[PDB]
Design a protein around this ligand. Structure first.
Ligand SMILES: O=C(O)c1nn[nH]c1-c1ccccc1
Ligand SMILES: [Mn+2]
Ligand SMILES: [Mn+2]
Length: 312
């Protein structure tokens, strides 16, 4: 079984872990525990807004929702290469729920965050919250594989996940989207005290829950919290904060991505054939320091073991 080397994640352990998980085996509770406490410490020290500089020769890969589709997560790393200092990643929330290999996804992602803390980035989604985990399978999965106490620890680690990432002061990445009120700025995002369950309304809620709409202005959300926001909302926010565009995730898309609001609101979704039912393609994005324009890479689902969606 995979073991830490002097209580630390190594590239060797991560390879063993991914193979262990491919073969439907469980990471020992002590190792899971250690990954969680160590990554909690890493994440707790980060700003709510992660601000990353991408030099002219450097690239980054942005992935959207993964939703416990562990075998598709491995496929991303086979198509795009494993994470490293020279192949950095952002995973933009919704790692868990729906898919029945959520534990394997999230421990794999936290492992890589510990191995490459400055080059492997995790942003919180609305599915990294208690109400979602309780309904949509992650709580059950953690209780089935480990204990109720292990779940409380996951919840507490999720609370320290940052809420957005800004690349070169120009691309802003969040899970959900923009805001239900006008005049919200990067300063406000930086100052969100994020170690909690999201409020019923406010900036923290919007970052996890909001959705673009084609028509101008805002609308009440079909989801019951946050809002739908139009092209004029995006345009104004970006002009006021000196940004080029936003990358969001949150929603399933048939092509794995959507380019909305005149090129200014991009969706990226990385869970192909969502819940073994939707038949959508997935995508990941490349960005370069010399060119911040998104390059999309589409991909289709790979086989996984016979465990149905939402089993837990
Ligand atoms: O479940 C999903 O696909 C999802 N991804 N982001 N938000 C949701 C969601 C949350 C609550 C109810 C329905 C969908
Ligand atoms: Mn979501
Ligand atoms: Mn989602």
């Amino acid at each position: 079984g995979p073991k830490l080397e002097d209580g630390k994640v190594t590239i060797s352990f991560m390879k063993e872990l991914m193979q262990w998980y491919k073969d439907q085996k469980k990471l020992h509770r002590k190792c899971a525990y250690q990954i969680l406490v160590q990554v909690k410490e890493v994440l707790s020290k980060l700003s709510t807004l992660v601000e990353t500089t991408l030099k002219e020769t450097e690239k980054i890969t942005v992935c959207g929702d993964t939703h416990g589709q562990f075998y598709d997560l491995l496929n991303i790393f086979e198509l795009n290469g494993l994470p490293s200092e020279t192949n950095p990643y952002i995973f933009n929330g919704d790692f868990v729920d729906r898919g029945s290999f959520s534990v394997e996804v999230i421990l794999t992602l936290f492992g890589f965050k510990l191995l490459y803390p400055d080059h492997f980035h995790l942003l919180r989604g609305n599915h990294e919250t208690d109400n979602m985990n309780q309904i949509y399978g992650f709580e059950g999965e953690v209780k089935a594989k480990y204990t109720a106490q292990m779940y409380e620890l996951f919840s507490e680690v999720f609370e320290w996940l940052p809420l957005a990432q800004c690349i070169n002061g120009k691309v802003l990445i969040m899970h959900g989207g923009l805001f239900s009120e006008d005049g919200v700025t990067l300063d406000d995002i930086r100052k969100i005290e994020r170690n909690r369950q999201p409020p019923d309304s406010g900036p923290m809620c919007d970052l996890l829950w909001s959705d673009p709409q084609p028509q101008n202005g805002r609308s009440i959300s079909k989801r019951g919290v946050s809002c739908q926001f139009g092209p004029d909302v995006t345009k104004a926010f970006l002009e006021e904060n000196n940004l080029d565009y936003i990358i969001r995730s949150h929603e399933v898309k048939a092509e794995g991505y959507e380019v909305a609001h005149g090129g200014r609101c991009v969706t990226v979704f990385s869970a192909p054939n969502y819940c073994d039912q939707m038949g959508n393609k997935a995508s990941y994005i490349h960005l370069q320091g010399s060119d911040l324009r998104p390059q999309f890479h589409q991909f289709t689902a790979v086989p996984h073991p016979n465990v149905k969606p939402m089993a837990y």
